[PDB]
Amino acid sequence: AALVVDNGSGMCKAGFAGDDAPRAVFPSIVGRPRHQGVMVGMGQKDSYVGDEAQSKRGILTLKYPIEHGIVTNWDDMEKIWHHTFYNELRVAPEEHPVLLTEAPLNPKANREKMTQIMFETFNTPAMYVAIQAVLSLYASGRTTGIVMDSGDGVTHTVPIYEGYALPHAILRLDLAGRDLTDYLMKILTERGYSFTTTAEREIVRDIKEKLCYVALDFEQEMATAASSSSLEKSYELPDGQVITIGNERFRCPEALFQPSFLGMESCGIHETTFNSIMKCDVDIRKDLYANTVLSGGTTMYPGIADRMQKEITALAPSTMKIKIIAPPERKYSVWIGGSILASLSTFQQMWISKQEYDESGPSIV
Amino acid sequence: TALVCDNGSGLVKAGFAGDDAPRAVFPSIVGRPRHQGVMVGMGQKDSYVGDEAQSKRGILTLKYPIEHGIITNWDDMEKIWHHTFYNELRVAPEEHPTLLTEAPLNPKANREKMTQIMFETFNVPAMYVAIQAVLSLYASGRTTGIVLDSGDGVTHNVPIYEGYALPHAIMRLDLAGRDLTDYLMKILTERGYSFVTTAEREIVRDIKEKLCYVALDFENEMATAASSSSLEKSYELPDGQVITIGNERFRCPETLFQPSFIGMESAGIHETTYNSIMKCDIDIRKDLYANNVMSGGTTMYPGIADRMQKEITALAPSTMKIKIIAPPERKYSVWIGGSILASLSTFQQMWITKQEYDEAGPSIV
Amino acid sequence: AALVVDNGSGMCKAGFAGDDAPRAVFPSIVGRPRHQGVMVGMGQKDSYVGDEAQSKRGILTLKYPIEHGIVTNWDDMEKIWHHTFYNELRVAPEEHPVLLTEAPLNPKANREKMTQIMFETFNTPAMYVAIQAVLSLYASGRTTGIVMDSGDGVTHTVPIYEGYALPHAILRLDLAGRDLTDYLMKILTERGYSFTTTAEREIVRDIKEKLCYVALDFEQEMATAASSSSLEKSYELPDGQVITIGNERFRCPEALFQPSFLGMESCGIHETTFNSIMKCDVDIRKDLYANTVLSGGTTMYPGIADRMQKEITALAPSTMKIKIIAPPERKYSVWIGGSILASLSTFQQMWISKQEYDESGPSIV
């Protein structure tokens, strides 16, 4: 059984080619142990990593090795893979060929560097680096389409032709997760419910999931919220105030459609989609608009789809079926899609083996 | 007295006639605020064009009127030109005759709508629209030959016989300085970078201008990449983070021969010259083969002259004289070609005035 | 003239715009009358407040209205401003607009609640609230930069871009005035000095200011102390024998950079600053590094400036000109920066006017 390792920006997933949910999930953090000052004796292992490093925190330097999908730093990122094998799944990479995740808009030299380290340091038998969205469409049982990822800090719209992305049109936009959560922190500052970062920022995120949703129409939902009481939801504490949030709940998703709310320059998330599509192939265009699919943590807002289908209908030619495919498990779509892919025997007729590295080196993928 | 104003899909170049280099260079972007955004220090403002819209892009909804040489929107086009006159050139249109440029395939109606707007709103005494690349052959000082007009947003081949361009040979390729700017953006993201904040989404354009080359012998240069010598060339970013870009540097203009790098099944520049000179008449082929001139924003990259030299000598066999001519000016030749023509002592009898215009109507131009 | 009221957690500072140095400077305390028993009554002045309360003490429940730059109670605090007006500066705020200064990431509702009290209870014509640190960068003669404040209770490292604080990078670390001194007590006691709980905590504090500093390198300062008695400084008590403290004087301030001595899970005053800056915009960073400022009282240990320039240079890339500005007056800097802003009429056309509370209400902050 081979590996699927979904190093989402702050959170690595791992396991085997053929499972239904990721078999090792962890924060991609490397902890560098420290107290400065010429400490006479530090401890064991120069870097911690993962859920260890999370507990260990105050004695480590914690940082995500990854930024936006990109390996920022190869050293502490290598410690992430070193953890995956000989700590997380307790595996040996020399036996286990690894599918490796790569972001939308992620070429060239880390692929080139990745194949070096994994074939020399970790002596993988074979490997394949693979676009996160390109597998996300595979989890939804598809091949042509346009996938929209929004995780923690990134939207992503990838024009897929037949299991191939058309890279120029792949949009990345600076709107997701945090930009909605710190903004939701700024939504609970008119009333406002204190969290700031002392450090109940997490509880703000915790509201975001459990109590927020999408207004299908902003205006009628505004007046309806002003009609009070049913939209207001109590966010009680097992302690202090039975805090009430009302307008918030639809207010914070709305910054996806109107970048007015956050000051940021953007076309709507609907037009991000449009600005992958129209930048590409025309004979696939309602096969794109009818295989428009979602991926990631900030997609899961309850009501985005009804809102999206409408908001693209405001733009696209009348004569195209807007059909918003959001899967049930859209948090893990990449790993699932990768599991299916590395369950193809034809993934053998597809990845790069050891052989082709010892001949071609870096540029082989 | 006269004015010349050249409308790129990214940059507008205006000035007077007979000046060597443009007096107004401004970005074709028209931005509307997403709020009644009181700039504390000015009153309320309607539309920002170019540089103000470009410094304040954050608060706006940016849009380009000239998409791929063509004008898609005349509202924004008009306010651009009022801006060209009264603000940029600082002129009163009714005393200063104006010249403009157009796409090699520009529609009759488009030509007429720019002639409607120039007289009927602005009231200029005499206006001309000319045809982009053909004017670069006038900056190259000749009547006949084939011009590769490759810009910010459009690549073109134009063969002109004695004044008349022959459009069947006039090829076009909607992949240029823009598709390439963003193609630099992506190949650095996994080189190990995150062009995250806004000046980085622009410094990637700058690094394109500063470091790019169209390497001659691209293949063994791929082995030079693999042998990593001092082709590695660092650059300081808008902050101090020395980014070292070496290989992708040439491995990006390379896309002008092989659109497969970005995902087009279309042919490269060189072939598209050969096919042009081919669809053209056979005795004329010789002139075209001997007067092949590059112009525009993509052509600035070094070695592109050498490249088309050896490319078409490999494609077209061997009784022929080939000559590719690349001017030191080339990023403005479309304007320089207008300016000097406008001021020509034999050109006054092509200055189509209001007298001709009112009696004949738009169809005079 | 308008007002500036630096409610530093245990010590308020008040006065006007235009004045050099704080015009009312006082123990932020409001004492309720007490005694228990149950008896006849009490009668006059339901809260004696400011230094009146500080002399009173053992007759009033005095309390501290702020902790960690977070307001712990509003009733007592309201009476800090009321004392400020009709006792300290002897003023009535309906004539006199106020400027107020809070913590870097002073909790949302505390900002607003503050303003309510000032706008309906103390009816100010106007008020500008802002973060204590931003003002301190203006005192430091800067607009962009990062401030590393350490008062009595907590640090704060505030990446200010152009006179604006960025909350997502601003960190706050529980290492300050108390934590230094409580260690320093535990470390005098090795020689049996034992001031413990007489009254002499303020004397362990007097030692702190008057005799401590920060080792430049630690291990070579250790051997240098171990060559004896120029590093030691003798100390006469208010009543008591001359003591001698040597190894102490650097050992305790080192412990801002070193949590292991205190026995704590924390980053060092150098590194928290690094991790604050990285969370800021890649570009602005160059002159966050090149303008680290120090402010607050518990920075004041001699040697810290040469120490911290080196200490950030252990952590930051070589391509950015590290330059730690620490002002000689780093207690008053927040009222000074306060007075700078309060002497600037652009902020008159910008501060929260009563009418904007009549429009927006509590939300206006």
- Would strands B98-102 and B127-131 be described as parallel, antiparallel, or unpaired? parallel
CA distances from B227 to A291, A336, B249, C313, C359 (A): 44, 38, 16, 33, 68
Cβ distance C169 to C276 under 8 Å?
yes
Contacts of C110 in chain A (CB under 8 A): 194
Phi, psi of C238 (to 5 degrees): -60, -40
- Over its C-alpha atoms, chain B yields an Rg (Å, rounded) of 22
Residues 6+ apart with CB under 8 A from A9: A28, A64, A66, A67, A68, A69, A151, A152, A153, A154
Contacts of A35 in chain C (CB under 8 A): 258-260, 268
Is residue B271 classed exposed, middle or buried when 0-12, 13-18 and 19+ CB atoms within 10 A define those classes? middle
Give the technique used to solve this structure.
cryo-EM
Structure tokens at A146: 């346009």
User: Cα A51 vs. chain centroid, distance in angstroms?
Assistant: 19
Q: Which amino acid is at C280?
A: C
Which chains contact A through at least 3 pairs of Cβ atoms less than 8 Å apart? B, C
Rounded to whole angstroms, the Cα distance separating A305 from A215 reads 11
Mutate to test the interface with B, among C166, C283, C286, C356 (most CBs of B within 10 A): C283
How many CB atoms are closer than 10 A to CB A150?
A: 27
Structure tokens at B44: 């309320």
Q: What is the dihedral of CA B247, B251, B253, B257, to 10 degrees?
A: 150
Q: What is the dihedral of CA C78, C81, C83, C89, to 10 degrees?
A: -170
CA distances from B286 to B156, B164, B169, B289, B316 (A): 19, 17, 14, 5, 11
Q: Is residue B103 helix, strand or coil? A: coil
Rounded to whole angstroms, the Cα distance separating B131 from B113 reads 15
Name the minimum distance, in Å, from the CA of B238 to any CA of chain C: 6
Rounded to whole angstroms, the Cα distance separating B93 from B88 reads 12
Structure tokens at C179: 């934590």
Opening angle at CA B288, ends B287 and B293, nearest 5: 120
Q: Could you report how far apart the first and last alpha carbons of chain B are, in Å? A: 21
How many CB atoms are closer than 10 A to CB C190?
A: 10
Burial A309-347 (b: 16+ CB within 10 A, else e): bebbeeebeeebebebbbbeebbbbbbbbbbbbbbeeeb
User: Cα C35 vs. chain centroid, distance in angstroms?
Assistant: 33
The 3-state DSSP composition of chain C as helix, strand, coil percent (nearest 5) reads: 35, 20, 45
Resolution for this PDB entry, in angstroms = 9.5
CA distances from C223 to B113, C231, C248, C307 (A): 86, 11, 13, 18
- HSE of B42 in the Cβ direction (CA atoms, 13 Å)? 6
Which residue is listed with tokens 């009181």? B38
Rounded to whole angstroms, the Cα distance separating C354 from C287 reads 37
Phi, psi of C139 (to 5 degrees): -55, -45
Cβ distance C219 to C226 under 8 Å?
no
CA quadruple B350, B351, B354, B355: dihedral sign: negative
Q: Is residue B52 helix, strand or coil? A: helix
Q: Quickly list DSSP for A16-74.
A: BTT-SS-SEEEE--EEEE---TT-S---SSS-EETHHHHHHTBTEEEE-SEETTEES-H
Q: What is the dihedral of CA C250, C255, C256, C257, to 10 degrees?
A: 100
Residues listed for chain A: 365
- Which residue from A108, A164, A165 is facing B248, i.e. has the nearest CB? A108
CA distances from A301 to A230, A333, C222 (A): 19, 16, 58
Rounded to whole angstroms, the Cα distance separating C225 from C222 reads 5
Rounded to whole angstroms, the Cα distance separating B218 from B224 reads 9
User: Cα A233 vs. chain centroid, distance in angstroms?
Assistant: 28
Is B193 touching C (CB cutoff 8 A)?
A: no
Which chains contact B through at least 3 pairs of Cβ atoms less than 8 Å apart? A, C
Cβ distance A271 to A280 under 8 Å?
no
Name the minimum distance, in Å, from the CA of A33 to any CA of chain B: 25
Adjacent-strand bridge partners of A243: A235
Q: Could you report how far apart the first and last alpha carbons of chain A are, in Å? A: 22
Beta strands in A115-240 (DSSP E): 126-131, 145-150, 155-161, 164-165, 171-173, 233-236
Phi, psi of C247 (to 5 degrees): -60, -30
**Strand order through the sheet with A48-49:** A48-49, A30-33, A60-63
How many CB atoms are closer than 10 A to CB A20?
A: 11
Is residue C338 classed exposed, middle or buried when 0-12, 13-18 and 19+ CB atoms within 10 A define those classes? buried
Residues 251-270 of C with CB under 8 A from A: 254, 257-260, 264-268, 270
Spell out where chain B is interrupted, by the residue before each break (C to N > 2.5 A): none
Which chains contact C through at least 3 pairs of Cβ atoms less than 8 Å apart? A, B
> Least CA distance to B180: which residue of chain A?
A168
Residues 6+ apart with CB under 8 A from A36: C257, C258, C268, C270, C271
Cβ distance C256 to C175 under 8 Å?
yes
Which residue is listed with tokens 């239904």? A20
Is C348 touching A (CB cutoff 8 A)?
A: no
Rounded to whole angstroms, the Cα distance separating B131 from B102 reads 5
Structure tokens at A50: 């993962």
Beta strands in chain A (DSSP E): 3-8, 11-14, 24-27, 30-33, 48-49, 60-63, 66-67, 70-71, 98-102, 126-131, 145-150, 155-161, 164-165, 171-173, 233-236, 242-245, 292-295, 324-325, 352-353
Rounded to whole angstroms, the Cα distance separating A111 from A130 reads 10
CA quadruple B92, B95, B101, B107: dihedral sign: positive
Residues listed for chain C: 365
CA nearest neighbour of B100 among B29, B14, B24:
B14
CA quadruple A127, A130, A132, A133: dihedral sign: negative
Name the minimum distance, in Å, from the CA of C42 to any CA of chain A: 33
Residues listed for chain B: 365
Which residue is listed with tokens 């709305």? A254
Rounded to whole angstroms, the Cα distance separating B364 from B104 reads 19
CA distances from B353 to A287, B90, B98, C295 (A): 51, 22, 10, 71
Contacts of A58 in chain C (CB under 8 A): 259, 264-267
- Which residue from C281, C320, C349 is facing B240, i.e. has the nearest CB? C320
Cβ distance B153 to B9 under 8 Å?
yes
Rounded to whole angstroms, the Cα distance separating A86 from A97 reads 15
- The reply to whether residue A165 touches residue B263, judged by beta carbons under 8 angstroms, is yes
Rounded to whole angstroms, the Cα distance separating A128 from A126 reads 7
Q: Which amino acid is at C266?
A: S
Mutate to test the interface with A, among C267, C269, C273, C280 (most CBs of A within 10 A): C267
Which residue is listed with tokens 């190990």? B192
Residues 6+ apart with CB under 8 A from B358: none
Cβ distance C132 to C6 under 8 Å?
yes
Contacts of B228 in chain A (CB under 8 A): none
- The reply to whether residue C218 touches residue A39, judged by beta carbons under 8 angstroms, is no
Phi, psi of A63 (to 5 degrees): -155, 145
Rounded to whole angstroms, the Cα distance separating A5 from A27 reads 13
- Which residue from C170, C258, C275 is facing A35, i.e. has the nearest CB? C258
Q: Which amino acid is at C77?
A: M
Rounded to whole angstroms, the Cα distance separating C288 from C67 reads 28
Is residue C309 classed exposed, middle or buried when 0-12, 13-18 and 19+ CB atoms within 10 A define those classes? middle
Burial B95-127 (b: 16+ CB within 10 A, else e): ebbbbbbbbbbbeeebbbbbbbbbbeebebbbb
Structure tokens at B2: 């006269």
Number of H helices, E strands in chain A: 13, 19
Rounded to whole angstroms, the Cα distance separating B77 from B49 reads 10
- HSE of C43 in the Cβ direction (CA atoms, 13 Å)? 2
Helix residue ranges, H only, chain C: 51-56, 75-83, 108-116, 132-139, 177-188, 201-211, 219-225, 248-254, 269-278, 286-289, 304-313, 333-342, 354-360
Which residue is listed with tokens 């918003």? A324
Contacts of B57 in chain A (CB under 8 A): 265
User: Cα A149 vs. chain centroid, distance in angstroms?
Assistant: 6
Contacts of B197 in chain C (CB under 8 A): 281-283
Rounded to whole angstroms, the Cα distance separating C341 from C18 reads 10
3-state secondary structure C65-109: CEECCEECCCHHHHHHHHHHHHHHHCCCCCCCCEEEEECCCCCHH
Structure tokens at C297: 């009282």
Q: Which amino acid is at A276?
A: S
> Least CA distance to A160: which residue of chain B?
B263
Is C286 touching B (CB cutoff 8 A)?
A: yes
How many CB atoms are closer than 10 A to CB A292?
A: 26
Which residue is listed with tokens 């007979």? B18
CA nearest neighbour of B211 among B227, B187, B190:
B187
Rounded to whole angstroms, the Cα distance separating B266 from B252 reads 17
- The reply to whether residue B40 touches residue C320, judged by beta carbons under 8 angstroms, is no
Mutate to test the interface with B, among C279, C319, C323 (most CBs of B within 10 A): C319
